[PDB]
Amino acid sequence: MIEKVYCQEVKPELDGKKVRLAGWVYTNMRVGKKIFLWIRDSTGIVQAVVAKNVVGEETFEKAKKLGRESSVIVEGIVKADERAPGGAEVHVEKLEVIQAVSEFPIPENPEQASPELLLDYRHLHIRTPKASAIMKVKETLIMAAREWLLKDGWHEVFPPILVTLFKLKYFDKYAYLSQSAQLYLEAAIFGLEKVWSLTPSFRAEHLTEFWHLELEAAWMDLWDIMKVEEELVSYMVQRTLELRKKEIEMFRDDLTTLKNTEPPFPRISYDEAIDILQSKGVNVEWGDDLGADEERVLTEEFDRPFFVYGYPKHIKAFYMKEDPNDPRKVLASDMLAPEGYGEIIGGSQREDDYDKLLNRILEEGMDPKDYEWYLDLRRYGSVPHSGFGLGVERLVAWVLKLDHIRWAALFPRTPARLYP
Amino acid sequence: MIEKVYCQEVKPELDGKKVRLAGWVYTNMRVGKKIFLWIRDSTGIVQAVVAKNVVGEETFEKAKKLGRESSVIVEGIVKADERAPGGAEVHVEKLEVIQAVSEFPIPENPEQASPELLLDYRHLHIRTPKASAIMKVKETLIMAAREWLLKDGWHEVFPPILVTLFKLKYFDKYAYLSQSAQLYLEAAIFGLEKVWSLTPSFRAEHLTEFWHLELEAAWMDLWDIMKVEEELVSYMVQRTLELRKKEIEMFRDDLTTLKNTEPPFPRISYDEAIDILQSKGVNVEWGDDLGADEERVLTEEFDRPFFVYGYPKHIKAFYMKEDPNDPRKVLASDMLAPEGYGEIIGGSQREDDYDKLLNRILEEGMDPKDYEWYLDLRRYGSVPHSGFGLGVERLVAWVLKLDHIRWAALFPRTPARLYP
């Protein structure tokens, strides 16, 4: 048990006290006759002052050789000094060099490098301040979702990843990698009523692997689930603004759209969306899908997340409930982030009528035999119900205005990239 | 928005108040001239009394046809009555039948059925009281782990599932399904120091898919990580005893070993383990693996979780640190549950010396080229570090004394079973 003092703990009120730092060399500079090592750990950076006449010639010479990412244990006495970072520095008595490094492959400022170099060295890139900040924002957004979910009475479940799309050999059968836990959450609402899961989902056609936060609720219609989505997203964003302002300010000059993320979110129908896009000069016809690029133009009209609802039936999945007021449409909505980010949540009310569902399965050239367990849910005490899925990395990318979603994944998976 | 009163809320102090129940028929029995419907929801069961002269003949005849799992909305007035369940029943004014059911495939007492029938109908089985109870115990054990992890200063990360073992085609390459996030958590401790993840892991040789709670920490040796493991497991079990006593009592006559789960856990060396097993008449030689069945006999000596530490190098994975006092051994330990359950956690101190690690990789007929990023971690500011993985379903199976681990999975995956 290395009993360490974290960098964030090194404060002017510790003046005259001994501390033990454990971390990595951030910078090494000679200042006067002395060596100033800035030591990084997970909480911050502290200035450790190494004086030849205190530590001796052998240690002083070792200290000169410590490049970026050298691992070190440092013991010394805190000195309050307004001119040091944090207003306190450490006057080094003992320096233990675990491993001297002089050729760390990630540049001092990593965004000087080619993104391809950074990704080939992803395992080293994630330790740097900005990449690390994204991971802290990610865990906080997720912690906040779990707070909200517990408070609001939702039950966490752990649905299957292997399903009967990536294909793999599975003993005497074949298995696919799940793209969504939804159908299994629908089975679970019959016992638990309000359920959620957080699972990796896979896309074999953009990350090919991503984190999927999904909710499903008995008794709720489309309008009810849209209230859930805006309440959940608002709490996640507000709680993260509260806790991670420092990290978010590394990525954003302007926090306005985040600050604006409180209920009620603006709501437009798909019909109004087509109107907005045609009125800005976009060649889209009613019934057409809104892909990435039409979504981008739509988001220009908004300064916070917003909903689009009431989609044409045939651009949405087989399981969606028809709008009973206009059977040409389904009771589906997506939540799009502003500033060009586009869809972060897709959800719907689900079809709860056995015959209507069987019929959609047939119409779509699917085999009702493969979906028998799914159809069972409309046979044994069917109830109205709705749910949705949020893309975690999509949300993080909007929150930090990232230029590619891959930076929101610890080790991103894309069609080109499986490594490290 | 069906604005419902949950079954657990129906209490004698609501005497004379209107409530709306939404749920499923648990039982239907005629008592005198009246129909008593017991209505299940996610929180409990309430007795709803349907009287012909209150609801009318048409509703009364509909009520007679309601078998198990009929979905219903019930409005009525609470009446405090010591003889009804919960001491309060609902006198029905309005009964809305969403879907009458008379042939639910899961028997009234599901453990009358063949386990194979229950699994073929897993999507319906999970709604029943006991299967549901396991899921509530599971989410609580996990919630408790997250409480402990946050309090103790660990950072949550979201490591990769696809790695360069199940095999799949991945565009122009092949990918494998991860069996453990460990090597990626080792990369992440350089930025975050104390990290954890909860991911599905896969075993292609017992579930083939399971939930893996894994921790990794800079600066910690084997003895330090064993303290973490016993503190984490104790909090998870004590917090779950606190919250889920009702659920656990469904499965256990005796809570003693759970109550005994507090630090310090007993610790024996692998050498003492071999001694214990030989002294009970088991044919095991030093250097031999302890498989399922030797572990079972070992657990007889213990009344709470216990550690076995200091394994022969060649029964453990390539990445483990040699015991510097006896290089024939590695600094590995497993935590075994009592009562025959056996291993719930496997962990170790990791090798932090570049040459020793390179050498183990060679000795094991592996190609150091494939592990270059892993070896990088011993090149760029290596630090001592340790970690471990806990099997969530294994822990749940011990906690509830389950006769098969598959019952702890929402939708279990085994070599024989991919469905539903």
From Swiss-Prot, chains A, B:
Catalytic activity from the UniProt record: tRNA(Asn) + L-asparagine + ATP = L-asparaginyl-tRNA(Asn) + AMP + diphosphate + H(+)
Top-level taxon of origin: Archaea
Ranges in coiled-coil conformation: none
Gene3D superfamilies: Bira Bifunctional Protein, Domain 2 (3.30.930.10), Nucleic acid-binding proteins (2.40.50.140)
SUPFAM superfamilies tied to this protein: Class II aaRS and biotin synthetases, Nucleic acid-binding proteins
One annotated GO biological process: asparaginyl-tRNA aminoacylation
The keyword Oxidoreductase appears for this protein: no
InterPro entries assigned to the protein according to its UniProt record, in alphabetical order: Aa-tRNA-synt_II (IPR004364), aa-tRNA-synth_II (IPR006195), aa-tRNA-synth_II/BPL/LPL (IPR045864), Asn-tRNA-ligase (IPR004522), Asp/Asn-tRNA-synth_IIb (IPR002312), NA-bd_OB-fold (IPR012340), NA-bd_OB_tRNA (IPR004365)
GO MF term (any one): asparagine-tRNA ligase activity
Keywords of this entry: Aminoacyl-tRNA synthetase, ATP-binding, Cytoplasm, Ligase, Nucleotide-binding, Protein biosynthesis
One GO cellular component, as annotated: cytoplasm
UniProt-listed Enzyme Commission number(s): 6.1.1.22
Subcellular localization(s) per the UniProt record: Cytoplasm
Enzyme superclass (EC): ligase
Family: Belongs to the class-II aminoacyl-tRNA synthetase family.
NCBIfam families the UniProt entry points to: asnS (TIGR00457), PRK03932.1 (NF003037), PRK05159.1 (NF003483)
Listed name of the protein: Asparagine--tRNA ligase
Organism the protein comes from: Pyrococcus horikoshii (strain ATCC 700860 / DSM 12428 / JCM 9974 / NBRC 100139 / OT-3)
Lineage: Archaea, Methanobacteriati, Methanobacteriota, Thermococci, Thermococcales
